[PDB]
Swiss-Prot record:
Domain LTD: 8-125
Result after altering R33W: In EDMD2; abnormal nuclear localization; forms nuclear foci in about 8% of cultured skin fibroblasts from heterozygous patients; interacts with itself and with wild-type LMNA and LMNB1; no effect on protein level
Subunit details: Homodimer of lamin A and lamin C. Lamin dimers then assemble into dimeric head-to-tail polymers. Ultimately, two head-to-tail polymers assemble laterally into a protofilament with a uniformly shaped rod of 3.5 nm in diameter. Interacts with lamin-associated polypeptides IA, IB and TMPO-alpha, RB1 and with emerin. Interacts with SREBF1, SREBF2, SUN2 and TMEM43. Interacts with TMEM201. Proteolytically processed isoform A interacts with NARF. Interacts with SUN1. Interacts with MLIP. Interacts with DMPK; may regulate nuclear envelope stability.
Entry protein name: Prelamin-A/C
Result of altering L110P: In EDMD2; interacts with itself and with wild-type LMNA and LMNB1; reduced binding to SUN1; no decrease in the stability compared with wild-type
Cross-link Glycyl lysine isopeptide (Lys-Gly) (interchain with G-Cter in SUMO2), sequence positions: K30, K50, K66
Shown part of the complete sequence: 421 to 551 of 664
Tissue specificity as recorded in UniProt: In the arteries, prelamin-A/C accumulation is not observed in young healthy vessels but is prevalent in medial vascular smooth muscle cells (VSMCs) from aged individuals and in atherosclerotic lesions, where it often colocalizes with senescent and degenerate VSMCs. Prelamin-A/C expression increases with age and disease. In normal aging, the accumulation of prelamin-A/C is caused in part by the down-regulation of ZMPSTE24/FACE1 in response to oxidative stress.
Result of changing L1P: Found in patient with severe metabolic syndrome; likely pathogenic; no effect on nuclear lamin A localization; no effect on the interaction with SYNE2
Length: 131
């Protein structure tokens, strides 16, 4: 039997301002979950989620023109390929994009209605195998 050895690192860099954080990002490109961590509702009409997968072209999801993330609640935005059911206010389906994107560097940023980044979560996976 041949010997095996590997080093795998998974890092998550999160930054949050305001009421809504990027709570969880799927490594399989299926969903992005946001959470209102405050005790007040947050209107997110025409807010955006910008996804930067390494040097890939930027993917931009846009919320419905009227959408509220209530206090303490979560919303999961599913890519169209995930096979999820569109069920607001907790589950929204991004019909135009089949995947959020897979890769070793995944940056997900929440953008408010005026174009400012208010929260983000960046996933980085590094793997080295001994040859």
């Amino acid at each position: 039997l041949e010997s095996t050895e590997s080093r795998s690192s998974f890092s998550q860099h999160a930054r949050t301002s305001g009421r809504v954080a990027v709570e969880e990002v799927d490594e399989e490109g299926k969903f992005v979950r946001l959470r209102n961590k405050s005790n007040e509702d947050q209107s997110m009409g025409n807010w955006q989620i910008k996804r930067q997968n390494g040097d890939d072209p930027l993917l931009t999801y846009r919320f419905p023109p009227k959408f509220t993330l209530k206090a303490g609640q979560v919303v999961t935005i599913w890519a169209a390929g995930a096979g999820a059911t569109h069920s607001p206010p907790t589950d929204l389906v991004w019909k135009a994009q089949n995947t959020w994107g897979c890769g070793n560097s995944l940056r997900t940023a929440l953008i408010n209605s005026t174009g400012e980044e208010v929260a983000m979560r960046k996933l980085v996976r590094s793997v080295t195998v001994v040859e």
